[PDB]
């Protein structure tokens, strides 16, 4: 009769358990039971592009409802021990794209169990999941990805339960909380349905986020040394060929300093082995460096044997060089960005 | 009766571990169980800005009040084996912002649990946590951070839990103790609140400490080296210009020396969206430099047509460069401190 | 009696479960038990030429006969819950080249028991092994790998256990959504035998892709430095020697240049105990600008005494050099395509 | 009454665990069990001061009596299999100062319960384990560092429990047969004592070394590639002001090496704020260099007009810059060394 | 009565583990039981240097005969499932100067139970450890080293215990199937002893392999260019001495690569106290790119008071440092055979 009878509220427990399968779903053979699912995002932890994972931390909670489980003359939610849940059926819920997950236990188990009067069960964990993203880098650094969640029953088909969003487009929450330096979320989205493999239908959750690059931090640190190096080897243009000692110099100093800069910055760059846009501007800036010597080097050559054709040919190299890097660069800005 | 007939103390426990559901908090159905908190800090391991975490290493003990295990006719402090934690019931007490905890087990679980003759249980944890900090790295290394941890109840609200800190602003102890290679702990804060979710409120105690960083070995291992790097690039300025070679590898060898220097520095610095002093610091020394070999070419660019010019722009660099760093070293060491 | 009944299910189960032995095998002391095997590749994480060894993870499933799970009274198959298992007799399969391979335990046991009324046994589970694969890289980056996982009974020798894939070659799926960045997969085989040891013959089940490397990465960021430093190298042959000095930095800067890249690219792969392809090419490359360095000292050497035999090595080797490195890299790529 | 009556055997010990209580210590609410540790080390497998820790391998073992476990007619010491250690009463013993620690399991546990007539139980385990040793890198590469082993009980306080050395001096073995590649063990302690929580008092058992670096590495790695320098660098003076290309190409080689070797340093360190000997001897050498570079390139500027001046400033150099690089030298080396 | 009939040997079974004591060896209080054990090498996934430890995964098995568990009327070889392990006594085997190991468990812990009509039981384990190896890189990288595993029992003295080799040498196979890419096993050997420790004696077996390291990726990787360096110092000495700029450049193009080729292999190893021989080797290569530059100063200290002299002094060193460098590179690589 009182709630605060401890001991009544253990009988109550002991009747639940007692003759409870943990290995019958509930409503087993019958209709299958709906699985409401919230997720509550604690933060995102890293977005790898060199292993394309991303680390996530998120509260998964699971609705369900269990008339087993139903009681009576107890006017309250019994919040039970994690403990309990390992004497009860719980839906075998997992993540299909994630590589290496846990459940938080210190400092016990994150696990919580809420039991209604109507039957229903909450269950929920803290989990830390390492989910998989493939990742289109040809537009890197300027790309935009989009990196999925999702959510999947391991062994009951669609006859046996059905899996839903529970709040609409609110079940997930936290997201504009995260704080992710290198990225910025854009939209993230959740999607309900089914899919069909060799041993029958499957339910499916998805929570998806479109992570769109930061921009400012490679303009700063990766194109704008390359663009100077360019003008600083074209500066040796405009030197009077009569003394090769500065221009010989400024090229020189202009290859090292690119090659340098390209062998840093692919230390620091993701290790992804294929072509990225990043790599063709800078294969394209040392190709134009490269040039520049080369004219150079024929002009100084054929200046001793036809002075006036090696004036011509400066002249026109001066006309030529400028105005075709700024189309190879807006045009590669075009069919980039 | 006598604590050394172990018997009787064997039949007294016996009779307090039966009946005992460990499904259900103390008091259950009635007011929520008052639990205190101290918190013995053996270590901060380390404190890493590549993953803006830090390692922390403490004994974690809760004192709380179960009538249930209330004994009498034993005057003694009751010390038990820590495995009849197992046979008990204990808070779902964990820590909010954790990336991966555990608890010792060599040569047990380092665990304690302590009964009282008016039935008050205390229950003690040795954990080493890794809790994500994040990090204002605007002004590196000469930024102050404040990293915290959150206690926080999983599953129960402040209906059926309430913590507080056993002992006021002594609760904490240890952190004068800690040995930070590369910080110093200005100060720790203690804060409890209520927090408010979807399920309802929450208890909540954050432990905050506010780190400074060391800037001595920065001092000796970026900024005098770049200094001096600046000083052997204006050296160049003491040469006659008819000797131009010399200048000229000196120049050479100054910015690919600097430019190398640069680059181990970055690639030993994480990656940050925004730009870190030291970087600035990197830039403007490294322009300095550059701009010191432009004006050197530029010299002997019109060294014989107009030597009086050549040698005036020489006289005036040699005072001009140093006052002009000395400047900008002035406005960096107002603005970042 | 109704299909429905949870209690009529609940007796039927233990009743299978009663008096059923988890130490013996179906048919125990009779025919071997065979075994169907089907696997869903959901993805391959990562190829390590430094571990050589591949991440793979994949939906393994078991199919087997039990008489002793034979039910009758009930038409529906029964998708019990993983924790059931541990009940039953499982095969001891393991595969024998894996490192560390373990089975997903989030939120629950990755692990599915499905029984069927005519005592039919389909045991599923997600495992992420990491096999180890055995390169050959002498032909890298132009390498064409044979990567193999193989499945073995441990404890039961062909005359307690038989393996075959169950749907011949269409047992295993998921090959066609492999997305490797590096390698693209060519083709799958399935081989099913019987291996010979001490012990008595085993069943085995060979599971093999042939991965092909893209070549696109290594010829952006490898080949075309090293070719454009070689031509870099060349250009000195049309500079006068009376430049003797500037030509000798052009030189020495390749060379210089050279040895950096080949530090870039020194710590990439581990320590084979042959020459690499692209090493290889690298020391081409070096021992043709080294020459080119020698040829231009001997030229100056002489370059006082004889400058009519100066002026024709020049003129040879601005043939020579192009042409050698031409058939050199036509033999090259001749030789490793 | 026959040893051999396996069942006998058997049945001792059933009885023995028979109403056998694991929650309450020897002789609970008497005088504290006395508990004999020693400590048999077979390796110590680094020593890191990137992170400032040792890993430690041992065979723990521990000795108490438990009357409870008396047997009685077997003239034996029972060797028990190591599960039934889960079935007694063990000591609470942790290890204060490590980060990670673990029992090895394979093929079993590497645990091992061995029973005496009398009631005493010894319990050995095979431990490793990763303990934190702050180290003072003031005088790196020369520092003597002191790195300890904290044993201490967790729950039961003094009242409960006592630890002691068993065997004296003589209780921890096998440190002779340490062999660090780049420390030296100079010497070991033993220390008994009691420490005081707000809970009570604990005992507590220390086993330190005294690790002493070895220079040897780094005498041929570091310090004589900057002298060889530094002296290199004297070369300039004496060349005279004509020959001005090779005193610029010796100059800037001798900074370039100089910087090279410091960044090389710099590569295999860890953080710290303050100054080690080796950072500012290399610092010194450095500065050094500088000044004679320094020094050629004003001599340049004003060799042009005052010849004699140059001569006098060369001569002079070949004098002070040796003399205050030995003075240098021989100032770090009292410093640091004594 | 059949052996085919499951019942009666599931009987069997039970009365083999009625009244079975897990906490008795066999012969308890009587005669030592000897354990007679194969080693079936599958691989040796690596050998480090820099932790001192070789990982080896290998079935190990163990033979002996527990006469509790003879049986009759059944003439079959029982294969046990793996958990029944948990019900019979096991040796304590252990490995002495392992660092970490582990038993594979997936898709079930690979653990084979095998009983005889005698009693005699085989228990084998797939095991993967991480075996100490102290190393004598006195001679690194032309050094042979020899890496034992040592076997012994924790608890149980000689009198409860003696190990042995089952079927002598041939105890151990598949070493000649070892794929190790820069070691080659050149042998192995197998002891069997007893060592006396404070409790007494205990039983031992030690497995050694000599691995003996290859040469040819330490050949083409730093010595050939170290070689090829030393060439290019010696290139300055076939040049005219008045042209100081070019020489100067050659020097000091030498020692920066001589100095970067050596520190980027520093890294290879820990701090050893000994000196290795790739290091005796670098520090030669670089005396002698440093002599060379040390010799063009002392010849343009010289240059103006005896021009004749400077150029006798550089034919002499023409002729002198090609010669004194092969004799470096002959004894050292003498020395080291
Ligand atoms: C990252 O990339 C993933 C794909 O890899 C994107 O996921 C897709 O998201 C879109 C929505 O943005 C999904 O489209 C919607 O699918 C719903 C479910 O379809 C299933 O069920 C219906 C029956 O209910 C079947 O007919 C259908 O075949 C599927 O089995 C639909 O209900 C939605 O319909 C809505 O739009 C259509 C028009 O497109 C209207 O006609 C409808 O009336 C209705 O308004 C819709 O089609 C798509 O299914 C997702 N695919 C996968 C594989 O997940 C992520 O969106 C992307 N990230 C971001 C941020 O966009
Ligand atoms: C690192 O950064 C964190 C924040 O990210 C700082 O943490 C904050 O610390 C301050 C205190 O320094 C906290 O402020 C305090 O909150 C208490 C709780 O408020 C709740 O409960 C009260 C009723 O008890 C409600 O009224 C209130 O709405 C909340 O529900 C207050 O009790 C404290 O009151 C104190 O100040 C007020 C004036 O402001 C006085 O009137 C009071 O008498 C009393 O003195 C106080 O407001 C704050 O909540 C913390 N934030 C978080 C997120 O935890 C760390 O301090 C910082 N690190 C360092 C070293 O400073
Ligand atoms: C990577 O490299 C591995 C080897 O290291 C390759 O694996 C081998 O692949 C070949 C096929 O290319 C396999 O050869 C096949 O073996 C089958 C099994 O033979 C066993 O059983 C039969 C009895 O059934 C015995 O007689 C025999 O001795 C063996 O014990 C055969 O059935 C196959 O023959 C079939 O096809 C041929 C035509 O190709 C027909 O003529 C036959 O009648 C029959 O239908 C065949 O001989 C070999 O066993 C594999 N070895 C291992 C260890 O796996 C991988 O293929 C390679 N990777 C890739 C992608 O190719
Ligand atoms: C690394 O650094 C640590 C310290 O950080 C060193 O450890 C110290 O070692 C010394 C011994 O070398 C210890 O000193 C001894 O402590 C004993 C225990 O003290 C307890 O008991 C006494 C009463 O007996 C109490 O007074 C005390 O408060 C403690 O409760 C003492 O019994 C010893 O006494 C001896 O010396 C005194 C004079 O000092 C004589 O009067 C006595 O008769 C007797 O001869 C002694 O004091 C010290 O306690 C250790 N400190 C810690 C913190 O453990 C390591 O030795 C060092 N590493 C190496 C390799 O040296
Ligand atoms: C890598 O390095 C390890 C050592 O670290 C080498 O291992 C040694 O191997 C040799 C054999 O090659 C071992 O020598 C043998 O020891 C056996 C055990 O000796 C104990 O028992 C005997 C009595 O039986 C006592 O007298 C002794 O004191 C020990 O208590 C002996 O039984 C062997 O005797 C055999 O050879 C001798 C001649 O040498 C004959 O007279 C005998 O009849 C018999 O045939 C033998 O002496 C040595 O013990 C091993 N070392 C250790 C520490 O155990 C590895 O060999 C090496 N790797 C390689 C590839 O060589
Ligand atoms: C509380 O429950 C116990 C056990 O069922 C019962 O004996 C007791 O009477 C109950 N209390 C009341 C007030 O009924
Ligand atoms: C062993 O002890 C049991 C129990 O006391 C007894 O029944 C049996 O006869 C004894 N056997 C021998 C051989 O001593
Ligand atoms: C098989 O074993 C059962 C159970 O012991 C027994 O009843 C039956 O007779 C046996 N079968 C034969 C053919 O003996
Ligand atoms: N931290 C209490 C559980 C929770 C928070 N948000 C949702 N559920």
Same mark, same amino acid.
């Given at each position: 009769n009182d709630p605060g009878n401890m001991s009544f509220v253990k009988e109550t427990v002991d009747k639940l358990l007692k003759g409870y399968d943990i290995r019958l779903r509930p409503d087993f053979?019958?209709?299958?039971?709906?699985?409401?699912?919230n997720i509550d995002i604690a933060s995102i932890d890293m977005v790898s592009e060199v292993n394309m994972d991303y680390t996530l931390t998120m509260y998964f909670q699971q609705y369900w409802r269990d008339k087993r489980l139903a009681y009576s003359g107890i006017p309250l939610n019994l919040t039970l021990d994690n403990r309990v849940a390992d004497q009860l059926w719980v839906p075998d819920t997992?993540?299909?794209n994630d590589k290496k997950s846990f459940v938080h236990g210190v400092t016990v188990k994150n696990r919580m169990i809420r039991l209604h009067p109507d039957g229903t069960v909450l269950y929920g964990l803290r989990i830390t999941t390492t989910a998989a993203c493939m990742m289109d880098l040809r537009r890197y650094p300027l790309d935009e990805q989009n990196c999925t969640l999702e959510i999947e029953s391991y062994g009951y088909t669609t006859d046996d339960?059905? $899996? @839903?969003?529970?709040?609409?487009?609110?079940?997930?929450?936290?997201?504009?909380?995260?704080?992710?330096?290198?990225?910025?979320?854009?939209?993230?989205?959740?999607? +309900?349905?089914?899919?069909? $493999?060799?041993?029958?239908?499957? *339910?499916?959750? +998805?929570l998806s986020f479109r992570l769109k690059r930061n921009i400012g931090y490679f303009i700063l640190q990766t194109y704008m040394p390359s663009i100077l190096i360019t003008i600083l080897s074209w500066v040796s243009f405009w030197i009077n @060929?009569?003394? +090769? %000692?500065?221009?010989?110099?400024?090229?020189?100093?202009?290859?090292?300093?690119?090659?340098?800069?390209?062998?840093?910055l692919r230390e620091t760059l993701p290790k992804?082995? @294929?072509?990225?846009?990043?790599?063709?501007? /800078?294969?394209?800036? &040392?190709? !134009?460096? $490269? /040039? %520049?010597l080369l004219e150079y080097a024929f002009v100084? @050559?054929?200046? !001793? +044997?036809?002075?006036?054709?090696? %004036? %011509?040919?400066?002249?026109?190299?001066?006309?030529? &060089? *400028? !105005?075709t890097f700024s /189309? $190879?660069? /807006?045009?590669?800005?075009?069919?980039?960005?």
């Amino acid at each position: 009769n009182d709630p605060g009878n401890m001991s009544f509220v253990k009988e109550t427990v002991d009747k639940l358990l007692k003759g409870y399968d943990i290995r019958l779903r509930p409503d087993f053979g019958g209709p299958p039971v709906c699985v409401g699912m919230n997720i509550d995002i604690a933060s995102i932890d890293m977005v790898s592009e060199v292993n394309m994972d991303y680390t996530l931390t998120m509260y998964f909670q699971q609705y369900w409802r269990d008339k087993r489980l139903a009681y009576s003359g107890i006017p309250l939610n019994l919040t039970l021990d994690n403990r309990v849940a390992d004497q009860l059926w719980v839906p075998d819920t997992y993540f299909l794209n994630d590589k290496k997950s846990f459940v938080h236990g210190v400092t016990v188990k994150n696990r919580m169990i809420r039991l209604h009067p109507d039957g229903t069960v909450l269950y929920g964990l803290r989990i830390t999941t390492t989910a998989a993203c493939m990742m289109d880098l040809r537009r890197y650094p300027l790309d935009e990805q989009n990196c999925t969640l999702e959510i999947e029953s391991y062994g009951y088909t669609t006859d046996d339960i059905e $899996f @839903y969003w529970r709040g609409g487009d609110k079940a997930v929450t936290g997201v504009e909380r995260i704080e992710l330096p290198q990225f910025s979320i854009v939209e993230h989205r959740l999607v +309900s349905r089914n899919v069909v $493999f060799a041993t029958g239908a499957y *339910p499916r959750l +998805s929570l998806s986020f479109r992570l769109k690059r930061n921009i400012g931090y490679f303009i700063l640190q990766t194109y704008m040394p390359s663009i100077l190096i360019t003008i600083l080897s074209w500066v040796s243009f405009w030197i009077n @060929y009569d003394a +090769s %000692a500065a221009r010989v110099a400024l090229g020189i100093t202009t290859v090292l300093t690119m090659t340098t800069i390209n062998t840093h910055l692919r230390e620091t760059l993701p290790k992804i082995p @294929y072509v990225k846009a990043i790599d063709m501007y /800078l294969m394209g800036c &040392f190709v !134009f460096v $490269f /040039l %520049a010597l080369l004219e150079y080097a024929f002009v100084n @050559y054929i200046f !001793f +044997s036809q002075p006036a054709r090696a %004036a %011509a040919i400066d002249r026109w190299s001066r006309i030529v &060089f *400028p !105005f075709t890097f700024s /189309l $190879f660069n /807006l045009v590669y800005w075009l069919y980039y960005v």
